[PDB]
Every structure is written in structure tokens, then in C-alpha cells.
Amino acid sequence: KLQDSLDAGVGNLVDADLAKESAKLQSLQTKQQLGVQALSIANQSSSSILSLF
Amino acid sequence: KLQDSLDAGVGNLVDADLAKESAKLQSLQTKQQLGVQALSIANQSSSSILSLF
């Protein structure tokens, strides 16, 4: 029983809660897609003054 | 982040604003043509007295 409690304590110390990580994964993949979109919109900025000349 | 800030500061120091450069270019070309025409009118001044003689 003592080694079982010790292994349970190691698991309580290091183990992660994957169910939170699922939603975190979805939000972060949506966020990186939006960030690539914003990065392209930022890259496009230089062209606007080409029409002024 | 510090390298990005230093590059932004160099750009704030030396970079020009092209959108105003376009308007100054238009006005300067028009002023050039007007100055060339005024120089021609100044060049024509000598001929008037040939009618007097």
C-alpha cells in the first residue's frame, strides 16, 4: 500500500490534465492561423504608396 | 525584441515619408516647366528694339 501511495504522489506531482490541453490545442491552432493572416496583412503594407507614383 | 527595437529606431531616424515626396515631385516638375517658360520669355527681351531702327 505504501508504494502505491508513493506512485500516486509522483503522478499527482508530474502528470498533466490532457482534457484542458485539448481545448488549448484547438485555440492555439486557430490563433496561429490568425497570426499568419495578420502577418500577411502586415507584409502587404508597402504596396499602397506604389500607386501614388 | 531589443534587436527589433533598435531596427525600428534606425528606421525612425533615417527613413523618409514617400507619400509627401510624391506631391513635392509633382509640384516641382510643374515649377520646372514654368521656370523654363519664364527663362525663354526673359531670353526674348533683346529683340524689341530692332523695330525702332
mmCIF file with all atom_site columns, C-alpha atoms in Angstrom, chain A residues 5-52:
data_model
loop_
_atom_site.group_PDB
_atom_site.id
_atom_site.type_symbol
_atom_site.label_atom_id
_atom_site.label_alt_id
_atom_site.label_comp_id
_atom_site.label_asym_id
_atom_site.label_entity_id
_atom_site.label_seq_id
_atom_site.pdbx_PDB_ins_code
_atom_site.Cartn_x
_atom_site.Cartn_y
_atom_site.Cartn_z
_atom_site.occupancy
_atom_site.B_iso_or_equiv
_atom_site.pdbx_formal_charge
_atom_site.auth_seq_id
_atom_site.auth_comp_id
_atom_site.auth_asym_id
_atom_site.auth_atom_id
_atom_site.pdbx_PDB_model_num
ATOM 1  C CA . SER A 1 5  ? 0.648  5.785  -2.348  1.00 0.00 ? 5  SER A CA 1
ATOM 2  C CA . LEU A 1 6  ? 4.143  6.848  -3.432  1.00 0.00 ? 6  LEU A CA 1
ATOM 3  C CA . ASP A 1 7  ? 3.414  6.212  -7.115  1.00 0.00 ? 7  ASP A CA 1
ATOM 4  C CA . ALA A 1 8  ? 0.129  8.075  -6.707  1.00 0.00 ? 8  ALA A CA 1
ATOM 5  C CA . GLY A 1 9  ? 2.081  11.004 -5.281  1.00 0.00 ? 9  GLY A CA 1
ATOM 6  C CA . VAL A 1 10 ? 4.523  11.003 -8.195  1.00 0.00 ? 10 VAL A CA 1
ATOM 7  C CA . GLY A 1 11 ? 1.553  11.022 -10.554 1.00 0.00 ? 11 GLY A CA 1
ATOM 8  C CA . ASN A 1 12 ? -0.071 13.861 -8.632  1.00 0.00 ? 12 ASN A CA 1
ATOM 9  C CA . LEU A 1 13 ? 3.184  15.807 -8.907  1.00 0.00 ? 13 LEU A CA 1
ATOM 10 C CA . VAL A 1 14 ? 4.143  15.442 -12.577 1.00 0.00 ? 14 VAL A CA 1
ATOM 11 C CA . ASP A 1 15 ? 1.089  14.318 -14.586 1.00 0.00 ? 15 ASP A CA 1
ATOM 12 C CA . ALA A 1 16 ? -0.768 16.769 -16.823 1.00 0.00 ? 16 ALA A CA 1
ATOM 13 C CA . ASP A 1 17 ? -4.529 17.109 -17.344 1.00 0.00 ? 17 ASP A CA 1
ATOM 14 C CA . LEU A 1 18 ? -4.889 16.384 -21.063 1.00 0.00 ? 18 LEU A CA 1
ATOM 15 C CA . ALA A 1 19 ? -8.560 17.395 -21.238 1.00 0.00 ? 19 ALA A CA 1
ATOM 16 C CA . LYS A 1 20 ? -7.578 21.034 -20.733 1.00 0.00 ? 20 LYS A CA 1
ATOM 17 C CA . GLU A 1 21 ? -4.817 20.580 -23.308 1.00 0.00 ? 21 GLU A CA 1
ATOM 18 C CA . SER A 1 22 ? -7.331 19.568 -25.983 1.00 0.00 ? 22 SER A CA 1
ATOM 19 C CA . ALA A 1 23 ? -9.134 22.919 -25.862 1.00 0.00 ? 23 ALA A CA 1
ATOM 20 C CA . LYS A 1 24 ? -5.795 24.690 -25.532 1.00 0.00 ? 24 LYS A CA 1
ATOM 21 C CA . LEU A 1 25 ? -4.622 22.917 -28.703 1.00 0.00 ? 25 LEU A CA 1
ATOM 22 C CA . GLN A 1 26 ? -7.703 23.978 -30.652 1.00 0.00 ? 26 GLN A CA 1
ATOM 23 C CA . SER A 1 27 ? -7.392 27.593 -29.531 1.00 0.00 ? 27 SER A CA 1
ATOM 24 C CA . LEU A 1 28 ? -3.677 27.713 -30.337 1.00 0.00 ? 28 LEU A CA 1
ATOM 25 C CA . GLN A 1 29 ? -4.035 26.288 -33.838 1.00 0.00 ? 29 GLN A CA 1
ATOM 26 C CA . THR A 1 30 ? -6.796 28.804 -34.574 1.00 0.00 ? 30 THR A CA 1
ATOM 27 C CA . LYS A 1 31 ? -4.559 31.511 -33.105 1.00 0.00 ? 31 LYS A CA 1
ATOM 28 C CA . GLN A 1 32 ? -1.549 30.599 -35.244 1.00 0.00 ? 32 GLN A CA 1
ATOM 29 C CA . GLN A 1 33 ? -3.743 30.636 -38.345 1.00 0.00 ? 33 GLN A CA 1
ATOM 30 C CA . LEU A 1 34 ? -4.998 34.115 -37.457 1.00 0.00 ? 34 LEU A CA 1
ATOM 31 C CA . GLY A 1 35 ? -1.411 35.175 -36.782 1.00 0.00 ? 35 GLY A CA 1
ATOM 32 C CA . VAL A 1 36 ? -0.259 34.069 -40.226 1.00 0.00 ? 36 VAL A CA 1
ATOM 33 C CA . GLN A 1 37 ? -3.182 36.052 -41.643 1.00 0.00 ? 37 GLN A CA 1
ATOM 34 C CA . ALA A 1 38 ? -2.170 39.184 -39.729 1.00 0.00 ? 38 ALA A CA 1
ATOM 35 C CA . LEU A 1 39 ? 1.456  38.677 -40.768 1.00 0.00 ? 39 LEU A CA 1
ATOM 36 C CA . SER A 1 40 ? 0.472  38.612 -44.442 1.00 0.00 ? 40 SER A CA 1
ATOM 37 C CA . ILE A 1 41 ? -1.646 41.739 -43.982 1.00 0.00 ? 41 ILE A CA 1
ATOM 38 C CA . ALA A 1 42 ? 1.370  43.422 -42.368 1.00 0.00 ? 42 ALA A CA 1
ATOM 39 C CA . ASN A 1 43 ? 3.614  42.316 -45.248 1.00 0.00 ? 43 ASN A CA 1
ATOM 40 C CA . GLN A 1 44 ? 1.229  43.856 -47.795 1.00 0.00 ? 44 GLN A CA 1
ATOM 41 C CA . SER A 1 45 ? 1.552  47.394 -46.384 1.00 0.00 ? 45 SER A CA 1
ATOM 42 C CA . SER A 1 46 ? 4.413  48.637 -48.580 1.00 0.00 ? 46 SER A CA 1
ATOM 43 C CA . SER A 1 47 ? 2.462  48.454 -51.861 1.00 0.00 ? 47 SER A CA 1
ATOM 44 C CA . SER A 1 48 ? -0.022 51.258 -51.124 1.00 0.00 ? 48 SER A CA 1
ATOM 45 C CA . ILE A 1 49 ? 2.426  54.056 -52.000 1.00 0.00 ? 49 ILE A CA 1
ATOM 46 C CA . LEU A 1 50 ? 3.336  52.434 -55.329 1.00 0.00 ? 50 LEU A CA 1
ATOM 47 C CA . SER A 1 51 ? 0.051  53.747 -56.751 1.00 0.00 ? 51 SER A CA 1
ATOM 48 C CA . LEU A 1 52 ? 0.946  57.315 -55.731 1.00 0.00 ? 52 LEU A CA 1
#
